[PDB]
Amino acid sequence: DLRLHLLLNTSVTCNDGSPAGYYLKESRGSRRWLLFLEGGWYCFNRENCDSRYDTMRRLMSSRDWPRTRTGTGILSSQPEENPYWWNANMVFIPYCSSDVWSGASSKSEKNEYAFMGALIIQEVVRELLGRGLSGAKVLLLAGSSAGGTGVLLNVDRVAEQLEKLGYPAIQVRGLADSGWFLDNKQYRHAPTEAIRRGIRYWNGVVPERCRRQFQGEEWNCFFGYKVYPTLRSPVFVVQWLFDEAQLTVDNVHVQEGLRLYIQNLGRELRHTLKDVPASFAPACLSHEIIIRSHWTDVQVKGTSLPRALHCWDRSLHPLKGCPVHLVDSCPWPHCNPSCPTG
Numbered sequence: 352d353l354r355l356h357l358l359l360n361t362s363v364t365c366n367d368g369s370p371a372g373y374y375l376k377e378s379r380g381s382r383r384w385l386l387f388l389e390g391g392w393y394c395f396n397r398e399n400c401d402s403r404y405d406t407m408r409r410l411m412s413s414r415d416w417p418r419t420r421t422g423t424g425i426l427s428s429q430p431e432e433n434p435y436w437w438n439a440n441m442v443f444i445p446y447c448s449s450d451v452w453s454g455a456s457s458k459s460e461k462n463e464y465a466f467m468g469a470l471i472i473q474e475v476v477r478e479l480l481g482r483g484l485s486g487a488k489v490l491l492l493a494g495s496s497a498g499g500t501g502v503l504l505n506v507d508r509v510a511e512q513l514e515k516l517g518y519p520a521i522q523v524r525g526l527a528d529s530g531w532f533l534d535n536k537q538y539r540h541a542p543t544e545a546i547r548r549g550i551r552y553w554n555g556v557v558p559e560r561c562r563r564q565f566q567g568e569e570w571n572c573f574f575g576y577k578v579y580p581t582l583r584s585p586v587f588v589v590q591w592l593f594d595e596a597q598l599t600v601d602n603v604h605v606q607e608g609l610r611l612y613i614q615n616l617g618r619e620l621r622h623t624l625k626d627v628p629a630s631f632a633p634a635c636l637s638h639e640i641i642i643r644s645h646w647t648d649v650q651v652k653g654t655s656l657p658r659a660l661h662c663w664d665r666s667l668h669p670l671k672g673c674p675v676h677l678v679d680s681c682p683w684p685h686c687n688p689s690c691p692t693g
C-alpha cells in the first residue's frame with residue numbers, strides 16, 4: 352500500500368477547490384523515485400465538466416479519496432510482479448484536474464473550476480524533496496493515457512525545477528504509456544478542436560521549445576510526434592500500434608475500406624516512432640499497460656517491457672542482446688502472439 356498525503360499548500364487544488372495530493376510508499380534503501388500520473392480523459396467547457404462532476408467525481412475532487420492504494424505493475428514492490436524497479440520509492444499522483452496535466456488556473460469569481468495539473472505536479476515534487484527525494488539519483492516521471500501525454504508536457508519542466516532549486520545531480524527521465532496520439536482523419540465524420548478549446552479554458556501550458564515553434568497553435572504540442580522532438584530529457588515511449596482510445600476518437604468500432612484504414616493507422620504510428628530510440632510498440636488492440644498486473648506478459652521480438660526498460664537504464668550509464676527500440680512490423684491487430692487476451 353501507498354499512503355495518501357494531501358498537499359500542505361492548500362492553494363494547489365483539484366477541480367472543485369479541494370486539496371490535491373499524492374500516495375507514497377518509501378524505500379529508504381533506494382535512490383530511485385517513480386512518480387506516476389493517473390489518466391482519465393478530460394473536459395473542455397462548463398457543460399461537459401459539470402457532467403463529469405456528477406458521475407466521475409473522484410477525477411475532480413479529493414473529498415472521497417481513500418487513504419491507501421495498492422501498487423500494481425510498475426508500482427508494485429514485489430520482484431515477481433515488477434522485475435524492473437521493485438525496490439524504488441513509489442508515488443501515485445491522482446488525476447483530479449481534467450486538463451491532461453496542463454492547467455495553471457485557479458477557481459475564482461469568473462472560473463467555476465480550477466485547472467492546476469501542471470502546478471499539482473509542480474508542488475508534489477517540492478514536498479517530496481523534504482521526504483527523501485533530495486537524495487535521489489533518478490526521478491522517473493511516468494503516466495498512462497492522459498497521464499502519458501502529461502509526461503510529455505511536464506518532464507522538461509520538472510528537470511528545470513530541480514536545477515533552479517539546486518539539485519543538479521538528480522537525473523529526470525520520462526515514461527509515456529498510451530499517450531502518443533495521431534491527429535489523423537477519422538473513419539467516419541474531432542479531437543484537435545476539443546484540445547484547442549480546452550487550452551483556452553484551462554490556461555494550459557506547453558513546453559517552451561514546442562511553444563516557440565508553433566507560436567494560437569499550442570494544441571500541436573499535445574501530440575507526441577510533434578512535441579517529443581523538442582524535449583531534452585530522455586523519454587521512453589510505450590504505445591500500442593492499434594490503441595483503443597485512438598480508434599474510439601477515429602469512430603472505429605471487416606471489409607476493404609476499414610481494413611485499409613486500420614492498416615494505414617498502424618503504418619503511420621510505426622513511422623512516427625522510427626527515430627525514437629527508446630520505445631516499445633506491439634501490434635495489439637489494447638489501451639494502457641504499465642500499472643496493469645500482467646504487464647510482464649507482452650513481448651516484442653522476444654523482449655518484454657520490463658526487460659526493455661532495464662536495457663534503457665543500462666544505456667543511460669548499443670548493448671548485446673539487451674535492446675531498447677522495439678516496434679512490431681506486422682500489420683494487423685494481434686499478429687503478435689503475446690498480445691493481451693483480456
Ligand SMILES: COCC(=O)Nc1nc(-c2ccccc2)cs1
Nearest residue numbers: 392451496497500532573596599
Ligand atoms: C492529444 O490528446 C491528449 C489526450 O490525452 N487525449 C485522450 N483521449 C482520450 C479518449 C478520448 C475519447 C475516447 C476515449 C479516450 C483519453 S486521453
Ligand SMILES: *[C@@H]1O[C@H](CO)[C@@H](O)[C@H](O)[C@H]1NC(C)=O
Nearest residue numbers: 360361362363470471473474
Ligand atoms: C502555494 O502554491 C501557489 C500556487 O502554486 C503559490 O502561488 C504559492 O507561492 C505557494 N505557497 C507556498 C507557501 O509555497
